[PDB]
Amino acid sequence: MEIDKELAPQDRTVTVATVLPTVPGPSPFTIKQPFQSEVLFAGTKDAEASLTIANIDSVSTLTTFYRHASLESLWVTIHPTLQAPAFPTTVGVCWVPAQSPVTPTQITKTYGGQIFCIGGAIQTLSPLIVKCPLEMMQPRVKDSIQYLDSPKLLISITAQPTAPPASTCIITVSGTLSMHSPLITDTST
Amino acid sequence: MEIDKELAPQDRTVTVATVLPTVPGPSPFTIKQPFQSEVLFAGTKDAEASLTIANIDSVSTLTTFYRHASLESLWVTIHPTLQAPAFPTTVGVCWVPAQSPVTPTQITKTYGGQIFCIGGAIQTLSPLIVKCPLEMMQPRVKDSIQYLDSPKLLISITAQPTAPPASTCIITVSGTLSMHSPLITDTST
Amino acid sequence: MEIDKELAPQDRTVTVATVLPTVPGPSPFTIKQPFQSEVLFAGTKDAEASLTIANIDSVSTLTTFYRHASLESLWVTIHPTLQAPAFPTTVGVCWVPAQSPVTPTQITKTYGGQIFCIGGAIQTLSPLIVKCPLEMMQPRVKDSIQYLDSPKLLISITAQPTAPPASTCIITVSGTLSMHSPLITDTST
Amino acid sequence: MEIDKELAPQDRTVTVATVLPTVPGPSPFTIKQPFQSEVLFAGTKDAEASLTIANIDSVSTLTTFYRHASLESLWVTIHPTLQAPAFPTTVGVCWVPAQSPVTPTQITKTYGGQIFCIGGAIQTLSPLIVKCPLEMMQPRVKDSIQYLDSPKLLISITAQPTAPPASTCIITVSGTLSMHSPLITDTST
Amino acid sequence: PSPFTIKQPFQSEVLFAGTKDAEASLTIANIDSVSTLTTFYRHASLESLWVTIHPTLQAPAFPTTVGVCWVPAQSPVTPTQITKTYGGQIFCIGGAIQTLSPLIVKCPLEMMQPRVKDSIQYLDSPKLLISITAQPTAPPASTCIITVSGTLSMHSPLITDTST
Amino acid sequence: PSPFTIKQPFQSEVLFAGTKDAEASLTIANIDSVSTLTTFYRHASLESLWVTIHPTLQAPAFPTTVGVCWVPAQSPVTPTQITKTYGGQIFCIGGAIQTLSPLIVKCPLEMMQPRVKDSIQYLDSPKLLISITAQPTAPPASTCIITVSGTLSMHSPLITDTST
């Protein structure tokens, strides 16, 4: 059967991060929490965006109150809008560790870097998905220390010269994270 | 589920290369480093390209510090832009050993030779890719000697008469390198 | 996954050729050589072409110097151009033994005969392939004698009334052949 | 990989024919001969067709020299032309035993009856084919007697009002014949 | 699993001294040659490291007091106190002894954090201290060149712009 | 089968320095002493190699800045950047320290192609870089001599005119 869900996984390679093992002791209980964070309403003008995932509101807030929290799964979705057909848009995407100094401008010079045309031609409007390869990133987003290779997302938008009246597509990033160890603070709000 | 990739593998055949063996002794420490290299912003005018992989930005750069470098995987990807739907474009492509006397215009007279129409609301804009058949070539882009069959890339662009405002598609070339035995030089920058 | 390669194999039947067996003796070494020969740049005007494959330059030259050479594999490819979408073209194709007196005009009255619309509508721009069925042809293209049932290719083009500014598609034929027994002649050029 | 063929098999059911046994004795030498027959250059105006396969050019011709001829396979193919994209066309089709009183206009009132829209940038131009269900009919197109259920083909064309310059699609009929026991006649020509 | 590292050596010009008195506090992981090699990796450790003092022909005419000392990044030491700290030592580059193996001073990585690029920021990586005291009636050009060499052990590719 | 090689040592005068500033980029397999020994063989590898700086009596009166650096033929380095590259190092030859074993600088063949003559042309054979900076008010004669010695491991006779 069909599935309105097209996905373009990023070329990869083997690269690890060094993570802090826990001190010897008793395993704490862990719970998982998922989310979807708005990243950008594009298509109207060329624009770009780079962002350390570990720092967006959705994460920041779910983690308030816990000392540690890693990322179980993470990806970004491109949701084509109703303006996408009449106005084909170019979107660039790349998952990269916080420490990589690349800018969206150079997505195409970067290894995993990808580029898509959104709308305007046969099969272009299914929503797109690029799973982030935590396999080669730094999954931890809250720990006893701050890491510098947590996931960072690079997005590049190249809009129509004669632009659309509104965003041709929405980009959200979503995933789910695990956390444990309560952060003993003021709970009264 | 659907994947946003289209493959146009080159017709192949047996034809091999020869290479010398690093000096007897202990296997030297070796790294692997991947890359994507901007090769062409096509679509606006017709153009050619005779690229000796061995010395394209990303590669020359990477290898810059080693005396030995072999290619573990190589391919060219054609990312269609937002102008692709409005402006079909003929793109030719051929993988050939550096020392093959062919010119882009001759892609169609050469065995592997391949050409496609990219664009138009009628066709699919999935990025199109031609993994390069290194078995057919000479994988060593850097050694103690000058091989003459390193891979060479042939690209032919035929653009719309009433051409587009900007490039209808981008051509990158990605791969992974296996370099070793460092070559002394200015580390300054 | 997807593959920019659509193929329409020809209806077939069982029909053999009588081939000259070699004289009793020692097997000679055999090598294979492949190729791609330009057949026609169509779409601009109605035109047609019929040709004994065994006689095209690419073959003629590879075989210079050998006494025997059969065809290991052979097919024809239709490569849609950037004009194909804006200008749908009708292409006819048929593999037939040299001895068949059919003309491209009557491809449709001939058994295997095929007809395609190129471009202009959904899924029309993938390059087309008709493997030649040597199974029912005369594979030998250079021997101790000339045969009359070697492969012959028939092509028919029916262009738009209001024609395109340039060829809507390229037709190349490609394949690979085996050869042996050197032809003792003047090698000095 | 993709194949440029689309099948529209006719809804079926049990219903058989009867046939007489060639005179007792030794099996007679028998040949098989295939064919493709031009049946209709449709698209420009509406039209019908009540074809008794038994006597269409290719068949009558082939059988011309035998007293017995059975059909081993039969089908109709609809090859869309270069005008198909610009001009959709309704094509009706039905396989029926010669002695079934149906007229093309009645395709839709008959069991197997089938009709499709051929053309328009929206639909696929893959040649469409209806293998004929000979089990349902009378395969003998030539015998010592006159069978009344040989296959009959019904075609109905409904053309664009603002009709096209030329036929939007061609209809052939191909098959393979099994004739035997030669019938004496003028071999002259 | 397993690593798959490479080792890469270097020599970095860090100071042309002798023209005027001068001080210097260098966090190694930031010196050009390093920040350059490491550019494409996620981890890089130092397998060996030292400072070298190449002397020019100015030396004989203009003797120079040169002090250097290896220390771990978060050591509170200032180049003025080289001789008060362990690794430290001072030299004279002049019309006397100069270049019986362009004086090197091996940095004792056993005493610090060799890691110079990781998933995190370390504070005890190698730091180099330099104190110069020159002729009052100064020389025309630099009296000596100070480099620091060693070799790196990097692994795990940092995905970035490979262009250049 | 088996080899049947011989080893032959040498010292080659490559530069008389000290009279004027000067640069030099020497592809070892081409220096006289070598192109000479190798003359009768089809293969020759280097088993050891280094540069030596013999100083004259001019040295004391006219100190000279002398830099040298070993590198593999296809290294893009220019003698001006000796101190920016690993092997590299600079000296002072003068009225101070000079000749506590006529300073040598071992070439690290582990880091290059020792083969200097083969069935083919290699590009990473040893190259020697030299940078000289002399007294403005120059000396009368050369301040020091620069040779490079080592030993060769040749085999397989190259059939030629044995006459001389």
Swiss-Prot record, chains E, F:
Q: Cite the source lineage.
A: Viruses, Riboviria, Orthornavirae, Kitrinoviricota, Alsuviricetes
Q: What does this protein do?
A: Self-assembles to form a T=3 icosahedral capsid composed of 180 copies of the capsid protein. The capsid encapsulates the single-stranded RNA genome. A pentameric unit may be lost during decapsidation.
Q: Which InterPro entries match?
A: Tymo_coat, Viral_coat
> What is the source species?
Turnip yellow mosaic virus (isolate Australia)
Q: Mind telling me what this protein is named?
A: Capsid protein
Q: Which Pfam families match?
A: Tymo_coat
Which GO molecular function terms does the record list? structural molecule activity
Describe the family membership recorded for this protein in Swiss-Prot or TrEMBL: Belongs to the tymoviruses capsid protein family.
Provide GO CC annotations from the record: T=3 icosahedral viral capsid
Question: Where is the protein localized?
Answer: Virion
Superkingdom to which the source organism belongs: Viruses
UniProt keywords, alphabetically: Capsid protein, T=3 icosahedral capsid protein, Virion
Q: Does the keyword Coiled coil apply?
A: no
Q: Which cysteines are joined by disulfide bonds?
A: none
